Protein backbone atom coordinates (compact mmCIF):
# COMPACT_ATOMS: atom_id res chain seq x y z
CA UNK A 1 0.00 0.00 0.00
CA UNK A 2 1.81 3.02 -1.39
CA UNK A 3 1.92 6.43 0.30
CA UNK A 4 3.71 9.43 -1.14
CA UNK A 5 5.30 11.52 1.62
CA UNK A 6 5.93 15.10 0.45
CA UNK A 7 7.82 16.91 3.20
CA UNK A 8 10.97 19.02 3.19
CA UNK A 9 12.06 18.64 6.80
CA UNK A 10 13.94 15.40 6.69
CA UNK A 11 13.39 14.27 10.34
CA UNK A 12 9.64 14.74 9.99
CA UNK A 13 9.62 12.94 6.59
CA UNK A 14 11.69 10.16 8.13
CA UNK A 15 9.41 10.05 11.17
CA UNK A 16 6.36 9.71 8.94
CA UNK A 17 8.03 7.04 6.76
CA UNK A 18 8.92 4.90 9.78
CA UNK A 19 5.32 5.01 11.13
CA UNK A 20 3.89 3.96 7.79
CA UNK A 21 6.58 1.32 7.24
CA UNK A 22 6.03 -0.24 10.69
CA UNK A 23 2.32 -0.10 9.99
CA UNK A 24 2.34 -2.04 6.71
CA UNK A 25 2.52 0.65 4.04
CA UNK A 26 5.09 1.33 1.31
CA UNK A 27 6.08 5.01 1.75
CA UNK A 28 7.64 7.14 -0.98
CA UNK A 29 9.66 10.21 -0.06
CA UNK A 30 9.87 13.57 -1.72
CA UNK A 31 11.91 16.45 -0.24
CA UNK A 32 10.56 19.36 -2.38
CA UNK A 33 8.03 20.27 -5.07
CA UNK A 34 10.03 19.13 -8.10
CA UNK A 35 10.98 15.82 -6.52
CA UNK A 36 7.29 15.21 -5.70
CA UNK A 37 6.22 15.83 -9.27
CA UNK A 38 8.89 13.37 -10.47
CA UNK A 39 7.34 10.81 -8.08
CA UNK A 40 4.06 11.01 -10.03
CA UNK A 41 4.56 7.84 -12.13
CA UNK A 42 4.21 4.03 -12.00
CA UNK A 43 4.01 2.76 -9.43
CA UNK A 44 1.30 5.19 -8.38
CA UNK A 45 0.62 6.70 -4.90
CA UNK A 46 -2.60 5.44 -3.29
CA UNK A 47 -2.51 8.53 -1.01
CA UNK A 48 -0.35 11.66 -0.76
CA UNK A 49 0.65 13.17 2.52
CA UNK A 50 1.41 16.69 1.55
CA UNK A 51 3.34 19.26 3.56
CA UNK A 52 1.82 22.75 3.26
CA UNK A 53 5.00 24.49 2.02
CA UNK A 54 8.11 23.20 0.17
CA UNK A 55 11.21 24.52 -1.55
CA UNK A 56 10.09 25.22 -5.15
CA UNK A 57 6.34 25.26 -4.43
CA UNK A 58 3.40 25.21 -1.98
CA UNK A 59 0.96 22.39 -1.23
CA UNK A 60 -1.88 24.35 -2.82
CA UNK A 61 0.15 24.40 -6.12
CA UNK A 62 0.91 20.70 -5.96
CA UNK A 63 -2.81 19.93 -5.49
CA UNK A 64 -3.51 21.96 -8.60
CA UNK A 65 -0.91 19.94 -10.50
CA UNK A 66 -2.65 16.75 -9.25
CA UNK A 67 -6.12 17.99 -10.32
CA UNK A 68 -4.86 18.74 -13.84
CA UNK A 69 -4.50 15.06 -14.91
CA UNK A 70 -6.91 12.05 -14.80
CA UNK A 71 -4.27 9.73 -13.36
CA UNK A 72 -3.64 11.98 -10.36
CA UNK A 73 -6.94 13.86 -9.99
CA UNK A 74 -8.42 11.03 -7.93
CA UNK A 75 -5.54 10.34 -5.50
CA UNK A 76 -6.46 11.10 -1.85
CA UNK A 77 -4.49 14.05 -0.42
CA UNK A 78 -3.89 14.57 3.28
CA UNK A 79 -2.44 18.01 3.98
CA UNK A 80 0.18 18.15 6.78
CA UNK A 81 0.00 21.50 8.51
CA UNK A 82 1.82 22.97 11.55
CA UNK A 83 0.09 24.88 14.31
CA UNK A 84 0.37 28.69 14.19
CA UNK A 85 -10.57 25.43 1.20
CA UNK A 86 -7.58 23.88 -0.32
CA UNK A 87 -8.53 20.75 -2.22
CA UNK A 88 -7.15 18.30 0.35
CA UNK A 89 -9.52 15.48 1.37
CA UNK A 90 -8.21 15.81 4.93
CA UNK A 91 -5.64 17.56 7.07
CA UNK A 92 -3.43 16.57 9.96
CA UNK A 93 -1.52 18.90 12.27
CA UNK A 94 2.25 18.61 13.11
CA UNK A 95 3.20 17.24 15.51
CA UNK A 96 0.73 14.31 15.26
CA UNK A 97 0.73 10.95 16.98
CA UNK A 98 1.52 7.81 14.96
CA UNK A 99 -1.87 6.22 15.68
CA UNK A 100 -3.63 9.46 14.55
CA UNK A 101 -1.81 9.42 11.21
CA UNK A 102 -2.57 5.75 10.44
CA UNK A 103 -6.17 5.95 11.56
CA UNK A 104 -6.54 9.13 9.49
CA UNK A 105 -4.88 7.66 6.41
CA UNK A 106 -7.26 4.67 6.63
CA UNK A 107 -10.48 6.70 7.14
CA UNK A 108 -9.57 8.53 3.96
CA UNK A 109 -8.63 5.48 1.81
CA UNK A 110 -12.39 4.89 2.31
MG1 LIG B 1 7.75 22.36 4.87
Amino acid sequence: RRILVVEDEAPIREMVCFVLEQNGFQPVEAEDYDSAVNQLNEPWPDLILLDWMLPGGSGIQFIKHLKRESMTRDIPVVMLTARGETGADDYITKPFSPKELVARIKAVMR
Side-chain angles (χ1 to χ4, degrees), residues 44-65:
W44 292 97
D46 305 6
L47 190 141
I48 293 149
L49 291 158
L50 180 56
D51 173 40
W52 128 70
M53 193 52 69
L54 309 142
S58 64
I60 274 159
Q61 271 147 190
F62 194 65
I63 291 169
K64 270 145 179 276
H65 176 87

Side-chain angles (χ1 to χ4, degrees), residues 5-69:
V5 184
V6 182
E7 165 67 65
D8 54 305
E9 291 174 84
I12 301 196
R13 185 177 66 250
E14 302 184 352
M15 176 60 62
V16 174
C17 282
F18 177 79
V19 168
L20 296 173
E21 251 283 338
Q22 292 305 122
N23 272 272
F25 303 80
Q26 176 168 305
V28 215
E29 304 190 44
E31 85 187 355
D32 52 32
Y33 186 100
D34 291 10
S35 76
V37 178
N38 309 143
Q39 291 286 221
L40 297 173
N41 28 83
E42 156 105 337
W44 292 97
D46 305 6
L47 190 141
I48 293 149
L49 291 158
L50 180 56
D51 173 40
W52 128 70
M53 193 52 69
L54 309 142
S58 64
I60 274 159
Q61 271 147 190
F62 194 65
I63 291 169
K64 270 145 179 276
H65 176 87
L66 297 171
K67 310 303 180 198
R68 274 189 285 273
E69 314 293 325

